[PDB]
Amino acid sequence: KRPKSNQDWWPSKLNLEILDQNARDVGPVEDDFDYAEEFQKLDLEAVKSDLEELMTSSQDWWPADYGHYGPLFIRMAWHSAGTYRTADGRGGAAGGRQRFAPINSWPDNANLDKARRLLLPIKQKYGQKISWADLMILAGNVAIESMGFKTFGYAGGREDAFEEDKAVNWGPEDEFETQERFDEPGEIQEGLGASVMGLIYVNPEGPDGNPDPEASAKNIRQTFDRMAMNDKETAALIAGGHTFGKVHGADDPEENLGPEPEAAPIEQQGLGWQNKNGNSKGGEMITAGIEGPWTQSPTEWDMGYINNLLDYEWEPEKGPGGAWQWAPKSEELKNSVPDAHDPDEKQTPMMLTTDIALKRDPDYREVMETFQENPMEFGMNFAKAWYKLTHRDMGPPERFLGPEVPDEEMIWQDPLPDADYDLIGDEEIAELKEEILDSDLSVSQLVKTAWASASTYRDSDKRGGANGARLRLEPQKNWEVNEPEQLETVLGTLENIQTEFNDSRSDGTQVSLADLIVLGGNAAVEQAAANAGYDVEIPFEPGRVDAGPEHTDAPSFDALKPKVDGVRNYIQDDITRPAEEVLVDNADLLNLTASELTALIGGMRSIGANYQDTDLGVFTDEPETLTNDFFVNLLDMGTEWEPAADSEHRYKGLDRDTGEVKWEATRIDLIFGSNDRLRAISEVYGSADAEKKLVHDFVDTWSKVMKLDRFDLE
Amino acid sequence: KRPKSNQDWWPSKLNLEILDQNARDVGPVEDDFDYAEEFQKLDLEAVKSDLEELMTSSQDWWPADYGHYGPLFIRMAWHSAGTYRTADGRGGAAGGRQRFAPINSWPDNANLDKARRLLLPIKQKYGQKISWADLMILAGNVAIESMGFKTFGYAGGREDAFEEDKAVNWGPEDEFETQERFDEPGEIQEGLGASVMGLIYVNPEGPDGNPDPEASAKNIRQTFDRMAMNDKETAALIAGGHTFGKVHGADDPEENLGPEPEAAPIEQQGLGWQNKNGNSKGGEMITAGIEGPWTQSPTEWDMGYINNLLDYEWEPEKGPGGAWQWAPKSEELKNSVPDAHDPDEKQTPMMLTTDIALKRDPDYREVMETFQENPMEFGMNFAKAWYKLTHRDMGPPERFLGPEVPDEEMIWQDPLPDADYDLIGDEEIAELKEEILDSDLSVSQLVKTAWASASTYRDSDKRGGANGARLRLEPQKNWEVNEPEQLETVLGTLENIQTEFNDSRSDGTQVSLADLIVLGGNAAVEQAAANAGYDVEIPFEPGRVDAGPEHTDAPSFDALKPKVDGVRNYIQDDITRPAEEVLVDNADLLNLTASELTALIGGMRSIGANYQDTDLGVFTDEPETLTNDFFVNLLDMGTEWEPAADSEHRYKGLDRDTGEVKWEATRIDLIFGSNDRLRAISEVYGSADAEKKLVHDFVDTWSKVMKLDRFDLE
Numbered sequence A, B: 001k002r003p004k005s006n007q008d009w010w011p012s013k014l015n016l017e018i019l020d021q022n023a024r025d026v027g028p029v030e031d032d033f034d035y036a037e038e039f040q041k042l043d044l045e046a047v048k049s050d051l052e053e054l055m056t057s058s059q060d061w062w063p064a065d066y067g068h069y070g071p072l073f074i075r076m077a078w079h080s081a082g083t084y085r086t087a088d089g090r091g092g093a094a095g096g097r098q099r100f101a102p103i104n105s106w107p108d109n110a111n112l113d114k115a116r117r118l119l120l121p122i123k124q125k126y127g128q129k130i131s132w133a134d135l136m137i138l139a140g141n142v143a144i145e146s147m148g149f150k151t152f153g154y155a156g157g158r159e160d161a162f163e164e165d166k167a168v169n170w171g172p173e174d175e176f177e178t179q180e181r182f183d184e185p186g187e188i189q190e191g192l193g194a195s196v197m198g199l200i201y202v203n204p205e206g207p208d209g210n211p212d213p214e215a216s217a218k219n220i221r222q223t224f225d226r227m228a229m230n231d232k233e234t235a236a237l238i239a240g241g242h243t244f245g246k247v248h249g250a251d252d253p254e255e256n257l258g259p260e261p262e263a264a265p266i267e268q269q270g271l272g273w274q275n276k277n278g279n280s281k282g283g284e285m286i287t288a289g290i291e292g293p294w295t296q297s298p299t300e301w302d303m304g305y306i307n308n309l310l311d312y313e314w315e316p317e318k319g320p321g322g323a324w325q326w327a328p329k330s331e332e333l334k335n336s337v338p339d340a341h342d343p344d345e346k347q348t349p350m351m352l353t354t355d356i357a358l359k360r361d362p363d364y365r366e367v368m369e370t371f372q373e374n375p376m377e378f379g380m381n382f383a384k385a386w387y388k389l390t391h392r393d394m395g396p397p398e399r400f401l402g403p404e405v406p407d408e409e410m411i412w413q414d415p416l417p418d419a420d421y422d423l424i425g426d427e428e429i430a431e432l433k434e435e436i437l438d439s440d441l442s443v444s445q446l447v448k449t450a451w452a453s454a455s456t457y458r459d460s461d462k463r464g465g466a467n468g469a470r471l472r473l474e475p476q477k478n479w480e481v482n483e484p485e486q487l488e489t490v491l492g493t494l495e496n497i498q499t500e501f502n503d504s505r506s507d508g509t510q511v512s513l514a515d516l517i518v519l520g521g522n523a524a525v526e527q528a529a530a531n532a533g534y535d536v537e538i539p540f541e542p543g544r545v546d547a548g549p550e551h552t553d554a555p556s557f558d559a560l561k562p563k564v565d566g567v568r569n570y571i572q573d574d575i576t577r578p579a580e581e582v583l584v585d586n587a588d589l590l591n592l593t594a595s596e597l598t599a600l601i602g603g604m605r606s607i608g609a610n611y612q613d614t615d616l617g618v619f620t621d622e623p624e625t626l627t628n629d630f631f632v633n634l635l636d637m638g639t640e641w642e643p644a645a646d647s648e649h650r651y652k653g654l655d656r657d658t659g660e661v662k663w664e665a666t667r668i669d670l671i672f673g674s675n676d677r678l679r680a681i682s683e684v685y686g687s688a689d690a691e692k693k694l695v696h697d698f699v700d701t702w703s704k705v706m707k708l709d710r711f712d713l714e
């Protein structure tokens, strides 16, 4: 007996549970737990020493191929980081969520349950000093190093999650290993990072199970791009990874493997895919259903993959597991590789349709030829791509911990420059605050600008935020939602204030535009509250610096461009899913709870910080005054709402007892009076004794968002 | 676009989301919000005056029948409290969850969205001073009073929830108004309070929609019984309720009513069942699909319902709504009632199959006849039953607030006596603990006894707990799970200690057996910790008292008897659901989170507090020593687990290589190493640096459970 969720009865119901996840922290760990502090206590080199010993310590319940677990661990690390999507920054290795459903049970993660299990003794030994997330990646690096390849570096700092990321939409499919997201290769439904449900990137057999390398390349390119990787990085990663190990498919997994972890017998204690006629295995292991090694020396770094792929012609065939795979035409490669477990048996190398794709696609082929001709270039590209792959969702350099962090900071870290001046103090803070309020800048202008600056933050991959003032740079300065010409006016005035202040300084003190933006919005909010009769002081943290275009990868920021922005009541005219759904999704990126989001939306509407200064949802007669008017008017039964004709997200509020129009609103405003849970929150804020509470709650949420990307002291 | 839940992929996946609700207080309310303190500031009289004013203030969007909203409100309050189930104490009006899905959209709650909406202005006016939960019941009371019937009393104190109760299992059906819970009237699947999914108690047309009065009576009796009501209380309630208002069904609801609230357009702002002729059309009003009043004066308390039912013959027929209903076989009742909205029209009374059932069923008939002959008794019974109905889930008298709380305390409140003596101090506390440990009682006995006393509590209806020491009284003293013979010995020793402590005091101090039971439990936990090398002090709050059999309804406590007890590793051999499912269900009644449950079970296993002192889950060589051995040994891959032959609950833990049988366990123990989320918690406690952490976490949880029912000091 399991409680039938409301999700079942009503598929269109909003998923507020993702916001409830932000209310607190699930897990037995304290709320003030600083993983960074703990990891710093870790003896990294001792963990690496134990990992290197593990590489060749074969366990009977899952015998190491070729007497070395290295390749398995690399796949484990690759898969952990391989679910990452640039669209929302979700997925990835940062929380080690491969350990929880549904990811722990995807077909593509088959037997990684054994791989993670092999690390349990080490995890237990170091305890809190190293998270599962950090450990899985470290295990991959150690595997690579132990097999002859020097890595680019390694950083700790990934805090373990204790459940699935409920905000992630992995696709529309109702069954794993099936796809309803693309008709033509290269045209996958927007957002999704994979071409098939339950897979990391693409089908190893080819699009729709067809061994068409050329088409495969189209999906490879698109999925990797959606995972932040270009053509060169993609080829380097695939070739680099397949230089090691083999694929397992002694027989058809469909009829020889037991239930996935989430559906397996309790006695199996978290493991799954138990062989119908097996529980350990080696010379008969079954994982993907495809069988064989890529190179003659699966546990050594070399040019084996690249040479085998490019130096011989391959042909498609059905392997022993009933899946598509390619075999060489020459007899030289016949039985050229030792068997994984039987010392007296040999095996012939094989390629996946996805490997042949790198040889068939003109663009990838150009890269592969270059790699074959210049091994050093191949190696460097692989080292850099692997580092990027595994650290892409960790944020700025401030969050990279440990003695193995590389001296070089990478552009994808969205690095911030050090401050070559003294931070302003309380006196200057007030000085600048007064100057801003004195300028011809309106409260709405200051609030909208500060929001545009801080609202890009994503707790998923730590990208975005007000620190750096990238709002003034490409592509943000030209985003439609930011109103380019209008923003230029505000920024010009603020930059004018920055200049006069710094030039009027005698010592070594200076102020950044990034801090001014936030100071302006804070001063504006306090002003809006004062206009309502409330005296509030929003805490300010100086220190933000101004990032330059030189260390800004403009194209990569396109992924942060919003299609919907509740605070500004901006809704793109072509969104697929309902507006409120996107609203909840974005609110989760800011670590907001359902109540916080509500206070933020309602409070912002009284200020009037709408995109293009419309009156959508502005249910008040005192613009730029922080009150609970939004809620009072929203809840008034004296008003009747109806969809606006010739408008997709627009609605009109008309006098009920009559019929005249009183208000204009969007689905974003109305969801708070329609959703059962949100309406209960609105009723609290709309009561005759809650205005002060809404004001203070708005301020608490505003302050929180302004400081989301300040890891300077985290 | 909504992320597919893991529950969907794996239907048998433990619903841990129910425990996640206990790790956070969703809603905009402050963390230190004391509703009791806020309600005490309320002017109850003023709210009642506003409510009485509303009764006759017809709103155009939902015209009042006979110009009086009273009946509608009675139904609203009745349905709010009517979902209560004695089995788990869940459902009911204490949280006002009728406002959230799925209840807010149940077919039986049609148009109650309009009823609650009429109360919004009042709710907003008084704000936090009165919860929706208290206001809905208060509205029903004022409605009754305004129509000539004084209520027995009223208590405030129901704190509003902000989400549905995810732990409640409303039934197996996948469709509303359908039933897959009974194959014969009176034989409803146990654990359910209704005979049909989406109804409060039973189908108004009769079992399976057949107008069979006698058959209907069987379901009415069983459903009301499962809602703590007997024959006389049931007849009083139904008769008293139907003395007011009418049923609405001008046309088929399956054709003229729009989507339920959760499925309605956003512009409806939380409303539903939109009438395709206009809601303002009082004459076209449709709710249940049945049309007509029960009495000649629907807005007046009188003997009209009983007289119409017993004094006239009724015959089955199809109403204007296409539903089965009954009409007078005579003609002196035709058009004897004025129309609810048309001044120049009349209407004939009607009866529901459920009403005729009270006339056909022998037992119900006897009660009704007695009522007709003694109107005073009918009133007396209805008044008390209504009070019980609307306050049954509020707990002990300590929780009843306000000037309208009766002087008399009812046995269903599980009342506790006052302590006519001074409470013990710190020195006496320490002395008693030392004395208990010095007795012949072992650490295990003391822990098991303290748990037996406190584990009965349930946050749902505030029943159970260690206060009152009802463990020593029927029926608890004889529950198989409490091991009667062993229990009598432990309690005998504690009682002797109580006696000697009391007789030795020279002042007016005394200690209760209730407090001694919990202190000996704390003492034992501290001893266990000390045995492991840890000095811990468990916070103890004196004040518990000893309740007697005179104020204990033994039969009502049967609902508190556990079928599964994780702490004691007790599993009844006839449960329907998997043991771990019941475990989670029970953990929620104790307000435990996933981590708390894990620390508790793990810690208890090292102590060894099992039922019948089995070695089930006791993975340690040092019993009565609080350590993390349960987690260390559970997670050791050197051990393999398999079902035990000839045993429905046991599993054997064997050494993978030697075949040595090392441990024995149940699903209760093994789930912590199988479920993905629980495994992550276990891995934390099972680390080499976490034994101290486990100890503190176990102690915090233990202390939490021991004080669950401490309302006295609030």
Ligand code: HEM
Pocket (backbone or CB within 6 Å): A065, A071, A072, A074, A075, A078, A201, A202, A203, A204, A220, A237, A238, A240, A241, A242, A244, A245, A246, A247, A248, A249, A286, A287, A288, A289, A290, A352, A354, A386
């Ligand atoms: C077009 C993208 C790719 C596809 C479709 C893919 C495919 C697969 C499949 C089907 C397997 C076999 C699973 C099994 O039977 O055991 C495998 C394993 C392997 N993959 Fe890839 N992969 C891709 C990319 C990558 C990347 C980017 C890396 C890491 C730089 C990597 C590294 C490995 C390693 C080391 C193994 C061998 C594991 C072992 O020996 O146990 N792969 N891959």
Ligand code: HEM
Pocket (backbone or CB within 6 Å): B065, B071, B072, B073, B074, B075, B078, B201, B202, B203, B204, B220, B237, B238, B240, B241, B242, B244, B245, B246, B247, B248, B249, B286, B287, B288, B289, B290, B352, B354, B386
């Ligand atoms: C065997 C149990 C019962 C059945 C199945 C049932 C039946 C129903 C149905 C079918 C309706 C009409 C809904 C509508 O069309 O507007 C109604 C309403 C009504 N019920 Fe009952 N009920 C039960 C008992 C109770 C109890 C215990 C009380 C409260 C003490 C009460 C209260 C009322 C009142 C006041 C109304 C009329 C509402 C109005 O005029 O709007 N009922 N009931």
